[PDB]
Design a protein around this nucleic acid. Structure first.
Ligand SMILES: O=C(CCCOc1cccc(Br)c1)N[C@H]1CCSC1=O
Ligand SMILES: O=C(CCCOc1cccc(Br)c1)N[C@H]1CCSC1=O
Lengths: 298, 241, 238, 298
DNA sequence: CTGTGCAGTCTGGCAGGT
DNA sequence: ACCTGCCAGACTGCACAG
């Protein structure tokens, strides 16, 4: 199988926690070591930690948490587990650290995540964002997470201001989060997402291509991938961004208004992603996306 | 042209990153960065001269621990190494194996002892006839056959650009006995290499025998040699003729 | 997964079961036509005869242009081959590069070889190989140049090795067979020393070293030891 | 205007005729020499002739007819207009000519042509397919239509076993026909159309892409294309063929049979094709297409 | 298979001019 | 920059004994 999508063990030293649509990835660094990856959303907290107890004897064996994104997709789980874990370094991009430090962004992220909760659950006690146990990482910093983990951080700007991607050199694994976009559940082809810049996004995808052939490509939506498509995932996301550029430019030349394509594209794509993202914000988000595409890269 | 992207895009990116660097340590630093990004711990770029025939000196730089470099330069394992000599046999990349170094096992015991067990080495003959090798190495995770071709092409691109710029920056590594024969001394040394004696070369050139003898003396002192066999052999080896 | 790596592995796999030169050049012709250019060629500058460095060549050009080389012998005068002797990068065909010998360029433009590339490479046994490719229109852009570089350097590597496996008459030099002692004595005397000094260091009489020298003399058909040492250094067999 | 669609004075030396969906192109290659391209479908004959008399002072002045391949959708007009154009000359690849000379693969052609005739339309007098004048042309042959235009035949196989395309070096247009395949005006992106050989089709598109930057581009449907889309039109066909291959292999991995994908493609894409293709036969066309891709892709 | 042979062409190295 | 003769030196294609 290609989309190794189920929870539990995935590879020799990799397990998926919680729901696949917003995964929380765990790495076996050694004998009494662990390291979460990709973060999570706020609603799944009592789920995700409850799965952690299956794969970890006791939570202290974690040492590092890798976060790849600023948005609500993956920062939501952080304040609701860090008090439980006695110690973990929330390794994340330097520009994202200022985002957590600011009071403005946390309002948006926490309110948006609280919108996603079920009618029952209230979250447990959680520390303020400023007191996160965080250590920034710049471009190219060699994260010696363990004996069998030499990960390189690459700053894949464009999808957000700050989106970094982690790449295990030894197993040719790559947690890209949303940089490659969003792997479509059904139709297979990649799905671009650019929300804050376009010209930098193609540069990031070029650097992702420049990384060697990928045994395992891992986005932050839809679980792990393997095989032929994961190898040229970097090329295909670039190509899909150009395809959406062509679609928007053709529609603009034909004279159909901007938002009508956004509504049609929302109707096309939002169904698989409904369970983490209410549609009213989905429309505005992809409206912003098509606005950036219309602005840049003729 | 934006249809395959991939490896060609990597090659253009590495060339752009490599070009403005002008400090040799910077060049090795970026190469070290690249070979870390492939998943291999250590690298080593070596150059085998052919100047001293009896004991061909082999100048090497890289990042293995420094006492192991001392083990090389004291016990002189460069000549006995068959990873370097594989370039003379063929232009094939060769992964390391206990079978490969059956000729010389002390090297393999020392290497496997000293934190190098898995690795490979790509030879190449530089255009000036200085057989060069680029080796890469790691501890665990034996090289998979699925992996090997990508390491092969990427190492070939790396050593091509590397030896190009190390030629450009005139490193100590590749400087030969610097000799610059102009046209007529190049011709006469060439003809001496073709075995024609002084009389034959003189009469076909119609130049006086003692004049060409003095030209041989100039060539003699230029290489600091006692006999024309040295002149002919070295001129052949270094491509001056 | 498609793309370059999977274009190199498949090409090597298709190359493996071949056992004849016609198949090798047939797959070269197919692959270069896939690349885009019309004609190919593979040249070999040997370094063995110093006074007249013999050059072998095989490709798909006009047969009369090959005959133009045999009648007039532009192998030595070719800058395209000669660039392999100095440097190793690809050289792109242009009027400036042929400016040393414009007569060759004039005939080449006349005979419909307008554009091309020519990659050299040192074969492992110290013997300059080069593979060139050409077409009639479309001067090579900077965008296509590097793709040409990678492909024309994966095929020249594999093809030089492949004809070395089939013992093609082009690549192989005159057969050479020296004992370990014969190679060792010739290596020692290749560094300029009298036979007497050699006899002292090897702890063997002068008669034996002169005997082995006579053996190498008869092997190389030499008139003087300098010839033997020169050819020995050139062939890279000491 | 990026895609000139309506018929008339399309360009200073060219005029589209007939329906835009299945057009025939007139080349004004001289004061005393014109020519035809892409000989369309049978039913539009009494339209096309009725359109042609707007331009020609006398129909005998026409000399050359250019044909792309043996499929019925582009060769319908020959037996109904070739006898009445006495000085016509038909150009095509030899593999087309062998097909026309063969009795087989002709009764099917006239049946499908007949099968599209909007209501009671008896056609005009039709000559047999073998007798009409043809001088087949091989790969790379330089064509002296007239002093100005010097077209070039490129052996662009893959949409069919005999397909060729007609390139001019002077003004850099290219009568593609279906080598690139159909153009989706609604989605603004090219349409793969493979019916014999994927492996030949992709390398044919590569040979198309290595040509200079095209100033203009004329597929066999959708009329002339102008500007930016002329240049990367070769690239987009390559892109779309690999895209649809990815979709096929992905759904095969998921487990959906080709029959689901054929229905999906039909309902998504047959809107352009409703006028000039049976819908039921269009489904079988996608079935043959996707079966060929399943066999030959990786 | 390798030490010893004078006889003899091959040829380092200035002496002295060009 | 490239020139014309010598003084032995370090050997040269066979020598056949060891
Ligand atoms: O051939 C090579 C490259 C040349 C030697 O590399 C070295 C060795 C010691 C210190 C340094 Br720095 C480099 N490596 C192989 C031969 C034996 S094991 C190995 O690493
Ligand atoms: O030798 C070459 C490249 C290969 C030419 O192709 C041929 C064809 C026949 C015999 C030979 Br040798 C080479 N020269 C280049 C530069 C000037 S013209 C040319 O093709």
């Amino acid at each position: 199988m290609l989309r190794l999508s189920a929870p539990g063990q995935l590879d020799d030293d990799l397990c998926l926690l919680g729901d696949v649509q917003v995964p929380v990835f765990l790495l076996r660094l050694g004998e009494a070591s662990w390291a979460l990856v990709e973060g999570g959303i706020s609603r799944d907290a009592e789920l995700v930690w409850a799965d952690l107890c299956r794969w970890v004897a006791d939570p202290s064996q974690v040492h590092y948490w890798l976060i790849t994104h600023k948005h609500y997709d993956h920062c939501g789980l952080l304040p609701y587990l860090c008090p439980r874990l006695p110690n973990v370094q929330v390794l994340a991009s330097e520009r994202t650290c200022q985002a957590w430090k600011s009071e403005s962004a946390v309002r948006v992220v926490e309110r948006l995540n609280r919108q996603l909760l079920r009618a029952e659950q209230r979250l447990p006690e959680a520390c303020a964002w400023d007191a996160l146990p965080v250590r920034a990482v710049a471009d190219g910093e060699w994260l010696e997470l363990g004996p069998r983990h030499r990960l390189q951080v690459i700053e894949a700007h464009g999808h957000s201001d700050d989106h970094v991607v982690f790449y295990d050199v030894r197993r040719r694994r790559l947690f890209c989060g949303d940089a490659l976009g969003e792997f479509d559940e059904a139709e297979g082809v990649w799905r671009p997402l650019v929300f804050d810049d376009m010209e930098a996004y193609l540069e990031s995808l070029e650097r992702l291509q420049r990384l060697p052939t990928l045994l395992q490509l891992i986005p932050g939506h839809g679980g792990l991938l393997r095989g032929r498509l994961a190898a040229d995932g970097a090329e295909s996301a670039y190509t899909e961004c150009l395809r959406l550029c062509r679609r928007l430019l053709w529609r603009q030349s034909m004279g159909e208004s901007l938002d009508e394509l956004s509504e049609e594209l929302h109707r096309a794509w939002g169904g698989q992603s409904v369970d983490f993202l209410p549609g009213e914000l989905h429309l505005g988000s992809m409206r912003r996306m098509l606005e950036i595409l219309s602005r840049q890269a003729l | 042209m934006r249809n395959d992207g991939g490896f060609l895009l990597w090659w253009d990116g590495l060339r752009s990153e490599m070009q403005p660097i002008h400090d040799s340590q910077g060049v090795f630093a970026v190469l070290e960065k690249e070979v870390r990004r492939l998943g291999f711990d250590y690298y080593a770029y070596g150059v085998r001269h052919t100047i001293p025939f009896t004991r061909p000196k082999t100048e090497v730089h890289g990042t293995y621990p420094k006492a192991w470099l001392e083990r090389y330069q004291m016990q002189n394992y460069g000549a006995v190494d068959p990873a370097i000599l594989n370039g003379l046999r063929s232009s094939e990349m060769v992964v390391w194996s206990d079978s490969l170094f059956d000729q010389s096992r002390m090297l393999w015991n020392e290497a496997r002892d000293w934190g190098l067990c898995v690795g490979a080495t790509l030879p190449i003959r530089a255009p000036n006839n200085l057989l060069s090798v680029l080796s890469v190495a790691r501890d665990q995770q034996n090289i998979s056959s699925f992996e090997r071709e990508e390491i092969r092409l990427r190492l070939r691109c790396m050593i091509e650009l590397l030896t190009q710029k190390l030629t450009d920056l005139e490193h100590p590594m590749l400087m030969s006995n610097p000799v610059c024969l102009s046209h007529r001394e190049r011709e006469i040394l060439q003809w001496t290499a073709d075995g024609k004696s002084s009389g034959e070369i003189a009469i076909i050139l119609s130049i006086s025998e003692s004049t060409v003898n003095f030209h041989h003396k100039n060539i003699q002192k230029k290489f600091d040699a006692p006999n024309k066999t040295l002149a002919a052999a070295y001129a052949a080896a270094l491509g001056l003729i």
